[PDB]
Symmetry: C6
Subunit: 102 residues, 6 copies
């Protein structure tokens, strides 16, 4: 848990899909000198807390227990027309004062 | 699916079009050591399911039976002027006047 | 009909303009092993049909019979100016005030 | 006239600035086997006809006969911040309140 | 302090996440011949000063006293889909309804 | 000034930040066969004139006489989130209600 270059800071870019970054988690997990028990624990636990709020909001929202594959399906929505069209459509409609935050 | 690399997850990014990714689906199959029955099965089932929600929403809109050409013509507009044109407006114009979601 | 790499997939992108793709048409046709007329036939039937809804919506707009020299001229602002510009301001104003679709 | 690659298709892309294309007009022409007068005619004539609507229309704003430098001074804004802060950025608010086009 | 290529200008892009830039910051902080205190000192004071105003405002916002990790985690939310979603939502309506600036 | 490639056309792109271009300005100067004074004159007079309107509107605003460090800091915001958030947000809200230009 938190091996050199692997968990202490592996981080998904704001424009970096969950795809490359998660792989950065897998391949770097291969690149670290971790025990088996060491990597499996790293994956579930850190992968979420450190990855791009677009998807981090999806890892937590899916609700824990979501199969990794499902995290991928959900994070695949990360993206412009899919995830951004909603974050731009939503954030803009809250400031449209039927529901603006004061 | 599940064959090595080719069809476990072959994914379509948000900016990667349905066009370029098709090759990712097929050309990557050229790499898996799978029977033709194994591959053609993959071309259909794993394609629509693990590829780009802008397009998937179109693969299930066109629906099954759509030749790849049908999934091609419609998903061609995936992108800003074609799809984002219809995507920004759908969420923006919905939540604002009548489709406001509480 | 499309011989290998010729008219089966010569497809334009959603970010790629009629300038780059049009070249793909002719060039990849040089790599095809087809009859002379096949190439001339290929352009009229496939090009307009399997090419990027930006240039495709322009092409129909041109009205068939517009020389390739003319299609080039027409689809030049494809890409951010001609096309992506006109497109955002329209969808935004059609669905919103009068052309609102229920 | 236009010898192969020189003036028949030297064109400025859509996202492309007058900078990169002007370099092309100035690059490909060297590759042309034209007469000294012909080339002089080529810049003033073909540079404006086939140079990017962001910046082309600019050449119309400056207007014909302007010094090439001025063509650059006014076509420097083409591209994300300068040109676009002004054109569609305005079109968003034009078609909306007073400039609504039926 | 401030050695060549190290801190005299080590600067992050407008969009560059604090990570890519920092891969520079750290790598070059290690390449300059600075005393253990000189470098360490630089990693504190300069890291916040010469870095992408998006992330810089975040840095100040977290407030000093937060672990370095927090400085970059917060800046990991710098952004296209995430940070920009929040900023775009607010700026547009700030000026429009209450925060109108004359 | 006016030596080949150095100050006649050294230009900042539209998406290119004040950093990359300034670098073109400084590096290209090394290429010109100018007197030491000649280059100094060149950095002040031209750097502000043929450099990307975002930063150019900033350079004038800072006010001449500002150190290169001052042009650098102020123009670091050139870019999307920092400079575009403000430009679009303003133009959009100026044209709309009170600052509508006839
Ligand atoms: O012109 P294209 O090659 O089709 O791509 C552009 C370009 O993006 P790039 O940075 O990749 O060249 C714009 O960049 P600018 O030069 O305008 O900064 C970007 O602008 P933003 O970063 O501000 O979004 C714009 O998007 P838009 O037209 O929404 O301004 C995007 O076009 P696409 O999103 O349509 O691919
Ligand atoms: C607010 C700002 C970011 C500055 C802005 C505003 C709108 C434009 C464009 C309109 N416009 C403006 C200038 C130059 C061109 C070019 F170079 F691309 F031709 C052009 O198309 N229209 C986008 C095309 C497009 C594509 C995808 C999503 C939105 C838009 C609007 C670009 C930038």
């Amino acid at each position: 848990g938190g091996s050199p270059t692997s968990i202490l800071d592996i981080r998904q870019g704001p424009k970096e899909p969950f795809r490359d970054y998660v792989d950065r988690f897998y391949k770097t997990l291969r690149a670290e000198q971790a025990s088996q028990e060491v990597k499996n624990w790293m994956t579930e636990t850190l992968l979420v807390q450190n990855a791009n709020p677009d998807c981090k909001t999806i890892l937590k929202a899916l609700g824990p227990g979501a199969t990794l594959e499902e995290m991928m399906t959900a994070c695949q929505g990360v993206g412009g027309p899919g995830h951004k069209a909603r974050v731009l459509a939503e954030a803009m409609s809250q400031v449209t004062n039927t529901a603006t935050i004061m």
